[PDB]
Each structure stands twice: as structure tokens, then as C-alpha cells.
Symmetry: D3
Subunit: 302 residues, 6 copies
């Protein structure tokens, strides 16, 4: 079972203005083959399908727990996309938008028109070419070593996509999200590498980094490492998965320092609200009446 906390894993800054094509690129990191939907769903299904949940508990704890962290990663990437697509972030009501004036004319020419037609200028479950995420992006073989090898690869392929998208987008919201997730994915690759070392004797962490560029070269990632985030494997559970430190121990590939298991989630930051976009009819063409209905619900609870 799962619980939800209404916080992003990190706070995000506010864009100056909408950037459709940046959003379209960041979609690769959400619904593309090596996006956060893929790391999420790989580890989630592997955790369901895991054989030897007690006999191989340290490894089950690892996969089950990282799966849970990836839920917050799809959330964070979606928030980044939504921030880039928001007309009026935080503004509950805009008046005077006239559909006859072609208020979405810009969207005719952007890469991803689906963001504005199918979405209400919001994230979709797709990659940078509009390709919808698919379940064949999941590998769940039941063989622990084969799955872990897959997962080590998956994390460094995902890293490579994050680096490339970072190099496309100058928006601070994207750069902050990517810098943070470069550090988190670095932890995951290190953890799966340590798991493989324990099971096979092959020194997988010595292959890192892939590509051969340090996260320290990405300023936003460097800041998060200066805060210690590359050391941290958070236990995203009230009471379970207490044996993470049997694998998540020893040296960090980033700097050689001792890694640590942190009890509980980080404190994070606020969730994002894109506000009213009347031309998208989102959350309504003119939401004033619906806001009054919601206000009255609180009154009649008395």
C-alpha cells in the first residue's frame, strides 16, 4: 500500500513565461523510454514480482524503496512541465479572454500541440516526440541479477537523457529539477552497482560516471552535492524496508565519502499550481462559480 505527502521532493522556481518547446523536451524525462515513468514502473513491477522477499530481503528493500522514490520523481517532472506550460502560475482568475481572438495562436506552431489540445496546457504521459509511454518499457524477468543489471543500465541511460535535455533548456525550473534528479539518479545507479558488487563480485561502481562527465560540472547538481544529497538513500516508509544500509554503505562514487540511509522522506517543497488558463478552459472557462461552490462546502460542514 502507499501514502501521499502533498510536497514536491524539492521546491521549484517560477518561470518568467510559458516555454512550450522546453516543456516538450522535458517530456522525454517523464514519458519517454528512459524517463521517470520507466524507472518508476520497472522498480514497481520488479518489487511486486520479487521472489524471495525475505530470503533476499536487502535487495527487495532496495527495489521496493527506490520504486517509491520514483513516484515523487514523476511528480517532480510533471510539475516542471506544468510550470513551463502555465500561462498564469498561481493566479486563480483571469477575466476577459475571448476564444474568438485566437488566444492559442502560438500553439499552432510549437512542437507539441497535444499539450494544448488534449491537455489543458498540462503534462501528458508521453515523451519528446509525442510518443505515449508504454508498458514494454518495463523489464521484469524475475531473475534478480538480470534485473539489477538492467536497472544499473536504465539509470545511466536516464542520466544521459537528463544531461542532454539540460543542455537544451536554460529555464531555471528545468535546470533545478534536472540538477536534483541527476544527484538522485546517481544514488540509484550507485545503489544498484553496490547490489551487483555484493551478488557478483564485479566492481560495477567503478564504471561510473556514465557518460564520463561528473555531476559536479552541472552547477545545480553541484549545489545539491554540497548539501550532501548524493550520500542519502531516504527510507520512504513508516516502518518497512529497514535493511537498506546492508547494501547502501561504503563509498560514494562522487567523492569517496560514506553514504547514509536517512529515516523518512526529505522535507521537500510546495506543490505547483498552474492557475487559471481561460483559453484552455482549465480548471473552467471562468471558475468563479466553482470557487464559490467549494467555499460553500466548508460552510455547510458545520
Amino acid at each position: 500500500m502507499f501514502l501521499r505527502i502533498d510536497r514536491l521532493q524539492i521546491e521549484l522556481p517560477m518561470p518568467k513565461e510559458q516555454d512550450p518547446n522546453a516543456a516538450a523536451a522535458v517530456q522525454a524525462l517523464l514519458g519517454g523510454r528512459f524517463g521517470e515513468m520507466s524507472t518508476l514502473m520497472n522498480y514497481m513491477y520488479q518489487s511486486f514480482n520479487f521472489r524471495g522477499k525475505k530470503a533476499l530481503k536487502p535487495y527487495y528493500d532496495l527495489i521496493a524503496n527506490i520504486a517509491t522514490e520514483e513516484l515523487g520523481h514523476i511528480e517532480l517532472v510533471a510539475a516542471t512541465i506544468n510550470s513551463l506550460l502555465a500561462k498564469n502560475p498561481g493566479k486563480d482568475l483571469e477575466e476577459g479572454v475571448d476564444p474568438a481572438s485566437t488566444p492559442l495562436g502560438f500553439a499552432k506552431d510549437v512542437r507539441n500541440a497535444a499539450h494544448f489540445i488534449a491537455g489543458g496546457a498540462n503534462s501528458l504521459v508521453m515523451g519528446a516526440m509525442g510518443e505515449h509511454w508504454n508498458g514494454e518499457y518495463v523489464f521484469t524477468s524475475g531473475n534478480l541479477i538480470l534485473d539489477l543489471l538492467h536497472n544499473f543500465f536504465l539509470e545511466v541511460a536516464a542520466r544521459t537523457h537528463k544531461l542532454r535535455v539540460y543542455e537544451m533548456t536554460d529555464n531555471p525550473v528545468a535546470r533545478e529539477m534536472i540538477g536534483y534528479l541527476l544527484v538522485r539518479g546517481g544514488v540509484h545507479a550507485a545503489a544498484y552497482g553496490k547490489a551487483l558488487e555484493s551478488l557478483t563480485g564485479v566492481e560495477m561502481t567503478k564504471m561510473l560516471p556514465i557518460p564520463k562527465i561528473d555531476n559536479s560540472k552541472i552547477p545545480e547538481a553541484k549545489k545539491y552535492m554540497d548539501l550532501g544529497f548524493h550520500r542519502n538513500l531516504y527510507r520512504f516508509s513508516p516502518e518497512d524496508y529497514r535493511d537498506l544500509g546492508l547494501i547502501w554503505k561504503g563509498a560514494s562514487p562522487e567523492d569517496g565519502t560514506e553514504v547514509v540511509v536517512v529515516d523518512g522522506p526529505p522535507t521537500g517543497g510546495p506543490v505547483f499550481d498552474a492557475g487559471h488558463d481561460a483559453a484552455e478552459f482549465a480548471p473552467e472557462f471562468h471558475p468563479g462559480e466553482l470557487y464559490e461552490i467549494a467555499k460553500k462546502l466548508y460552510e455547510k460542514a458545520k
Copy 2:
């Protein structure tokens, strides 16, 4: 962000036999168009994309919270499929399997060979025809009423699929899961119906049930209604989404009785472990050495 509890939402019975084609049918309820992946991802993305998270808070709480419940539903359906595919449920080691003896011969003739080739006799992210789940199964328009109308329909379509699959197999593991999720889906349809009533004045819950058959006629669903579980909307959050009762109030469609919000998840049941299946090399061809490695990780003194 999210947390995980290492428990299924309910206790499931022990499978007494492998039933591949029953598993293949139950896959519709996991990765088909109207399976639990679809209710999950619809509500998850709508929750990310929600505009007016404070101004329309009761409705945000509702979608965000139901999304979180659906995480446990994909888990429960996957455990059911894994139960139907398990050769040696709960058993850490089977010896003496020889690939040359054709130990997967039965799998040649089953509907879903992928369960045995791609999976290690485990669940996959697909429906009853082998179709992998896809992101175009998600509707996230940004318009609150349009989304809620979609979701009401989605829940009753999903219910229809559950009823049809129930009629295909008398397997007790599958029927236990379906009975429970008929009740839970009944709550979700009722909740979206109540949300629509509040926003539009249209008495959507008076359309229920769809199809025109009562859950009380399904013995395994009646079991859970007899415990009161159709009344309960569980708040799957430590501290957030506290305004569910502004919508989740008034009469149950099942029996006219007053519905209630329950703070926190139900107690749950243990997770499922399919055990060793040597022919699937899962978790290893012979996992004895890996089990010894895992045991030695605990020798870590202190």
C-alpha cells in the same frame, strides 16, 4: 511525495494451483484500457495537473487521494496474477529442475506466452490480449468537470470488466481480489458521482449501478459490504487531504447508509511471494548461493 507500507490492501488466499489462462484474463484488470493502471494514472496525472489546488481543494483532495489508493490496487492485482502464475508459492528452493526435460512445455499452448518468456512467470504491464498499457489510456484535460465525468465513466467501465473477468474464472484468489475491488471501485464511482452532483446539480449517483446488477449479488463483494467497507473512503496520507468529507458524505448507493472518511489506510494483509521457479531462473536458477550472500550481509556487527 509518497511512502510505502509493505502490505497488500487485503489478505488474499493461498493459490492452490497455477492457472495461466486465468492470469491472462486478470491482466485486463491490470494493464488493459480499463484496468487499475488506467485508474491509477488518470488520477495521478490529473492530480499533478490540477489547477486550483487551494481554491478547489475538496476536489483536489479527492483526486489526489483516490490516485494514492489506486497504487495499492495495481499492487493487489499484480499479487493476484503472480499467485496464479506461481509454481511453488512461498517456497524458497526447489531442486532438480532440468531444462532439457521441457519444464515449461505447458506454456507453449497457453494464451499468454509472454508471462513465461518475458516475465519469470510473473505479471506484466499489459492487458488480456498482450497489449502493453499505454499513456493514451490517460485523460487529463485540465477542466475539472470534464475530468470528473471521465472518471465516473472510467470507474463503471472498469467495474464492467471486473464483472466479466469474475465470470470467466472461479479461481478463489482472483474472485477475492475482484470482490474487494468491486467494493472499492463502487466507492470511487460514488465519490466522483457526489463530486459531480456538488458542481453541477445532476444526480449522477442515481445512475448507479452500471451495469444494472448490485455488488451484493457477487458473494465476494457482499463479504466486504457485510464488514461495512462500502462506506469507507480511506485517507492515504499522514497529514494531507483532510477535506474529503466535504464531498464523501451522505448516502451510499449500495444501501442508503451514511458514508464516512477513515483517516489512514486499512490494516492490510501480507505481501505475496511466488517462491523459487527454477525453470524461470527466478530469482535464480538455484538461489542457494545468493541466499547465503544475503544472510552474510546481516553479519555486519555493531
Copy 3:
């Protein structure tokens, strides 16, 4: 624009038994790559996209008119599938079905479970492997000769699929439909062949038949040829497309006799009603109340 006549293009026989796997095979002829959805949508879009609708009018008339015939062919193939899936053909009410008795148990083991889960034991927009029909099955290049060459090939590929499916099932409903559509497809291939001859001088009809087997060797096709139906190109329009005989003239490939345009559709046969299937909740679990509602709508006096 289009009009509809509530009749199948031919009378079909009453199914005597459900035959799921025969239905699954016949789906190739509906939603597979070379099924009736493909001939329909190819000619429909080519007709929309046609350049020179006046300057090349005989060829426009041909494609526009054959497209219209193919609407009745998807209808006929769907009726055939529905006949093979019908539990109680023509019967408005069956009572006493109990879901707990596993009334869909047989469907667990059939090839196409989607017919029973997604469909209410009815046709779906897919082929013999469950693959949903897709728009990339359409070729609409704007170049008349290239399109016509495509269409000649399409018809003989479709014929090949019909012959193979015919050889898979001796079901009389399926064979009646296939015999008729072998004849109709023979007309379409001949017509596109004659169109190519007129534009290029290449004697395309001399390539027929493909494969090298005569329709006269298929008893159910010979039935319709014995009535003269291989001669007939029906003009499915009240007033338009009057120049078909500029192309549809000269010898039939079947027997060398003169072909003719028939103004208007053939008489047809009744539509098919699969009746009540309570286990599929179709048209309702118990439709008695809905039938009473419908009856009362007629009480509307005047």
C-alpha cells in the same frame, strides 16, 4: 454526405452455435491490415483527397462509389462476427444467469478474450491477433495511378486473406459472407484493373485471378456468380457518380461476359440482432425494465 439503409448487403443464415475462435479469425477480415476497414478507409480518404474531381471524374466516381460499398462490407463482416459470438440470437430475454456460476468460463481459454471482456460478446475494431486497426493501413498519395495500383494490390491481398480464413472454418455464416465478398472484391479488383488499363495501357485484369484459383471453385462464391453478381457494379448514390460505366464496361475476368452498372443498391437482407446475453450485461443484465421504458415512449399520442 451519406445515407443509411437498415439492411445488410445480403441475407445471412442464422447461427446455430457460438464459435469464438472462428470469430477471432474472421476479425482479420474486419480490422486486420487487409480487412474491410482497410479497403473502406483507403477508398474513403482517397475520395476525400482526390484532385481533379471533375477533370478525372470517371475515376473519382469509381473510388467514391466503391468506398461507399465498403461501408456495407464492414457492416456485413461485423454481423458475421456478432452471429458467431451470439449466445441467444434474436431472443430479447434470458433469465436466471448468475455471475457466480462462471457463465463466461469458456472464454478464459479462447484466443480472443477481448471479445468477452471489452466487447459484450461482440465485434471489435481489430484483427485476428487482437491488433487494433490503425490509420497507417491507409495509403492516400494524391497520385491517381499510384493509388490505383495500391488498390488493385489491396483487393487481391484482401482476397487472399478471405480465402485463407474460409479454409479455417466451415461455419456457414462465415462462409456465406466470404463467398459473397469474394465476388464483390472480384468486381473491385477488376474495376481498378480496368481503370489502370485505361490510364496506362497495361492489361492488369489479365493478371487475375490472384492467387491462381477461381472463385467458381468456392461453392458459396459460385452461388452468387450463378445469380450474375460478378457482373454488377452497384451505384450506391441517389443522384451522383453517374459515369461509372465509362470504366466498368467490357469483359468480366470471371467468365468473359459483359459487365454492367446497376443504379442503386441491391435489395439486401435484414440486420442481425444477437439478442440478450445476461453474462455480458448486454444490452442490460436484465433488460425488462428498459424494454418497458422503450415501449412507453411510443405512448406519445397525437
Copy 4:
């Protein structure tokens, strides 16, 4: 069976010049998930699959007839796309185009290059991201109420897409088509809402409009309402489907006025011919010889 009339459901104006990206956006309304292919194919297959064609005749008439209207809607949207893609609308011959001069250079940079590579600058069976229409966009459950609920949703989701595309495209051809189809889809949603009211007692039409914006705010739609088109359900059949007025009666959601069944199709407008585009080789590189062949066909018919 079906018949064809060589008229669009409304006349369309002529664009000043080609607008590739407008065409690419309008594709959502043709081959996207909530485009006219989807309303067409949903109602078409539901009509084939309908159980109780006599006992539930008013509802069968409704679905069967609306399906027929949607055939003219795919035609109208395709004509709109073709109008936006036409280089030389109405012009049968352009001379002097040299492929070596890069006459399609502009198409290198447009959103939808397939329009110019796979199509001969013509419509394709796809949406606004190039995604080909697929049969999984059809819902045909066999359960009348479930299907009608689906269809009510489908029409208002389609409306939402039409409004968004309208807000992207200032081209009169697009605005006229969309204004007209907003009114027609308004009729369909009202009709399915009235059908649900009759079967369930739930006042579905009171939910309209969705989104909460009146068609009267869209100038082209307002004109069509001033002509009475929101009242009209046309009977697209010579002799069938005569019981539409048992459901299609009472108040219009637009203005409260009495709705009416119109015997027969509207008179409509001319079909569209994009003319010659030599760089697309459409209908031929230089069609002069083919036009002479067609002329001679009329001579030799004497």
C-alpha cells in the same frame, strides 16, 4: 448499407494560401482520440453490435443515425485540412514546376512533414502529433447505458478539442467547419443526454455546456444557431430510423426551444477539389494527358 451524396454538409470558404501548421492542428479533429473518426467509429460499431434492435428501437435509431451523420463529419474535416494544404485550389494545371528547385522546401520545417511526404499535400488518418487513428479509440460494450454514458462524454471531450483548435487557427475555413461542428456536436450531446434521461432519470442535459462556455460565444457557431441548426436532428436515411422524435424532443440546452427531427439530409455545399500540385505529383506530375484520356472516355461512350 449506405449511400453517398456528393455534397459537404456545409459549404466551406477558400483559404488565401496554404497553412500547413493549421492543417496539422485540425488533424486532431479528424484522427485524434476525440476526433470525428472516433465519434464515427464508436457509433458505427455500437450500431452494428446493438442488442435489442426492435425492443430498444428508439435508442438504436439514434445511434445508427448519428453514426451516419458522422460519416459526413470526417468528410467535412478532411475537406478543411485539404483546403489548408492546397497550393492551387480549383486550378487543374500548373506548369513549370521544377523538382530541382526545392519547391517543397517550406515543408522541411513544418510540424507535419507526413502531409507532404506520405500524403500528396492531403489529409491523413491521424491526429495533431502524427499519431494514426486506432481502433482502441472505440468503446463498444454491448451495455446500452454504459455506451450512452461513454458517448455523452465523448461528444463533450470532442467539443473541448474543437474549441481549443478554434483558438489556435484564424483561418475562415477552419472556423466555419468548427463553428458548424460545435453546433452538430451540441445536438449529439443533447441527444445522448436525453437518451440517458429517459433510461435513468438523471438529468444529464443539465450538465451542459461542458466546458462552461456557450456556443453563442463562437461567432460562426452563433450564426448556425441563428439559422436553427441546434434544433435539428436530420434523418440520414431514405426510409429507416423513423422513431428519432421519441428521444429527440423537448427543450434544446442552447435556448430552451423545441427540438425537431428533419426528414433527410441538409442541402449542404459543394465538395472541395485541391487542384494540381505538381511538386506533389498530385494527381499527376503533369496531368494533361490523363485529362485527355478522361475526355476521350466520354467520347467513346456513344
Copy 5:
């Protein structure tokens, strides 16, 4: 550029019976995600896309050459499927087949009806669920180490699928092919492992075997190891790719013995001819006349 030799990479045994469902399983090894189409197209595109073809030549030679071997592997797997589907292997003519006798009746009930409808009882470009091979099964990142890590994983995933299919069928044609390709895939995994060791210092070959079962335990693989074939990396080029031994050197993972480059292909075996299948119209319904045409082409004197 490429050349072709009209020989399979090994001699295969004569099939003694048709086995449709065995063919359907073996399709996973052809067009599934981890089939030979995937190893082929991965290495082929990586070879095209390779940066540093001179500066990193040993690694280019390796990928370019293994790609070429995989061409013969798709050929070998297709021949195996065709053997399992052949009615009359090696026989040019069967007379007396009558379509009306339902000669394809068995095919109604097999898993893969497409083999008999779309194919003429022959291989298709698809996996074990009928899923057509797709280009998203290719990973071509341009980063040498990332690609090589991918390829190491790909080979051991492919091996896992081969082992599972081997366990599904005791058909001798299938098992001969699988035994040989277990050996060949073992060479490829070892070679990519050695390439990774050279570039990273990580002892990837020490992870082998994955799964933890030796090829020597599969009798048909041991057959080929007993001939020495696990030592051999064949250079499939007349004059190019001469630096393979810079990487393909040192110990075999199978037995610790020294591996070698073999200049040129192995001798091979004859190609397979499934013979006439009249019910499939393959190569014609009755090919006697075509055989006479072919014979007469040789009468060409000189």
C-alpha cells in the same frame, strides 16, 4: 555494403511434423524485444552511427562485425520457424487440396493465426504475442561505453529468452537452433564484456553466466562447445574489420581456454525450403505452370 552466401550458419534437421504453437514461441527469438532482430538492428545502427571509426577502430570492428553475424541469426531463426510451419518440407508439388474441405481448420485454434492468414504458413516480423518488431527496441546513443553496457545486457536478456523457449518445446529443429545460438550469444556477451573491461577496468565477464546456469547443461549447446565453437569469433568480411583480436583474446568464460578470431564465415548448411502448401497458395495454389515458366527461362541458348 554487404554480400550474401546462400547457406544457413549451421545445418538444421528436417522437421518431422508441423508445430504451430512451437513456432509461435520461437517467434519471441525472432521479432520480440530480445530476439535476433533486436541484436541485429542494435549493432547495425550503432555501427552506422559510430563516432571514431578509426580512432576507436577495434571497438568499431567489433560492433560492425557482430552486426553482420546477426544477419545470419535472423535467417537461422526464420528457417527454424518455417520448418515448424512447413506442411510438405522440400516437396515441390502437392495436388488435390480443396479449400472447401477446411484444410486450415487446425489454424483456427492455434495461438498465432497470423502465421496462416498474413503469412503463407511462414515466419513474420513479430514476437510470441503477435507484437510486430519495432525500432524502439534499438538503443543507439552514440556513447561507446553506454552502448556496450546496453549490448552486454541485451545479449544476456536474449539468452534468458532462448533458455525459456528451449524449455517450452522439445522440437529438435528448435533445440538445434537454440543450442547453437546459445553458444554464439555466449561469444557476443563475452566479447562485449571484454570490450567493457578494456575501456573501464570492470571485470564484466566475471558476471557470466546470467542466468546462473552453464551452457554445458544444455545438450545441444554442449554439442557445439565440444567442437570448439565457443572459442570462435568469425570475421564476416572479405577484407575489413581485421583488428577483432585486440579485444577477442584471453580466456573464454565457458572453460577458461584461449579464444580466437576466425577469418571468414563457417562453412554453413543448406537453406530450408518449406515446399508447396496449396492451402496457403504458396508459392501458388498449383505451381506447375510457374515451374514450367522458370524451366523455360533456362532455354536461353548461347
Copy 6:
């Protein structure tokens, strides 16, 4: 089996600078429905699946041999795309690229962002809309005439796509590749036309050219015809497929001159190396160390 020669079928010129959208258009010719992957895989699978390999040998030789030529065509088109995507063609090391400077900013706005995210600025297995190539683009019926008719169509449809892309792209690398492949595809269509003439008596080559434009109007193609390349069917085999001249004889459709079989491949031109692109991490972020590793491999081979 197959062999590889490290030469392109023709030399290609060097672009002045990267042209992403030209690359995206040329992708249609690689992985689109009528691209070189399709001609390749059609003929390859038809050759595997061919019945009567001896009795119909001239036709088997033709398909098997043309399949082999198409391998070099996917190679040539990929080289063209890679040339258009290369930042630094031929340059082994660029220093000073800083990811923090947004060095991929241009790629945010191009049509095909996947080239820069999933690819390392390299070719992908997809068409001009990002659609990945799929195995349903292959037709392998087992019926010789039906397949040959398909293949004649396939070649002229492919030609049409090549002409359209030529008209979009002024880059010499694209124009040279397309001019050459127009001539080669002209040979293939002529050859399949001659095969059909021999088997059927229908004068298929008289339909050529399709579209009705001569290759002589494309300057690059004209040059290759002036060199005689339209006459040449190269035998891409050491010793096999020696009966091509039984079909490949008589008049060329281009100019009436006698066609010829050439023993062996053409001499071709150099393969292409895109060089270092540090922002793509291709072949490494900074490949200096890897180049030193490769150098040392040659030293330690002594």
C-alpha cells in the same frame, strides 16, 4: 549468411553545417513505411520464406539478391542522416564544450528532438514523424506473384517518397544519396516488373515511370544514368545467385538500352564518421583517454 564490406555504395559529400530538419525529413527514407528498412525487410523475409527455392530459382535469386543490396541502402541513408546531424564531421576531438552553456539549445526547437536526446545526434530507426519502423510494414504472403506485385508497388511508392524529400532538401549530401537511390530503385522496380511479365504476361514495365516524371529530370540521378547505373543489377554474393540474367535482361525502362548483370558489388565510397560531439557525449564527453586505450591495444598486440 552475410558478409560486410566497409564502404558505402557511393561516396557522399560533406555538409557545410548541421541541418536537423533535413535529417528529420530524410528519416522517412530510412524508417518510414516506404523507407529502405521496408524494402530491405520485405525482400529479406520473402527470401527466407520463399517456397520453391530451386524450382523457381531465377525469382528466388532476384529477391534474395535485391534484399542484400537494400542492406547497403539502409547504410547509405543512415550515413546521409548522420552527415546532416554531425557537428564536427571527421574531427576526432573538440575541447571546451560546457553543458552549462546550453550547447544543445537549438535542438529545443527542431522537429525531431529524439535525434539529440535518444540519439547522440545520430540516426534512429524511425520516419519523418518520429514513428518507429515496425514489422507490419513487411508483406510476406508466400505467394510469389502476390509478393512481386506488392514489391513493384513498394518500389514506386518508395520512389515517390524519395522525390518528395528531394524537393524539401537542398543539401548536396541528401541530393546525391537520393539521386543514386532513385536510379537503384528504378532498377528494382524494373526487375520486379520484368519478373511479373515473365510470370503473368502483363507488361508491368510499361507502367513506368510512376509518378510520370523521368529520373532524368533530377540532375543527380541523370549523372548516375550517364554512368550507366540504371542498367546494372549487381550480384552481391561471392558465388550465389548466378541466374539473375534470366529475368534481368532486355530493355531498360529509362532509355531502351540492354540491361546487365554485374558480377560483384560496385567499388563505392568511404564510410562516414561524424566525429566528436561533446555535448552529445559521443563517442565520449572527452574521448582522449579512450583513444589512448585503443592505441595501447595495438601496442600490446606484439
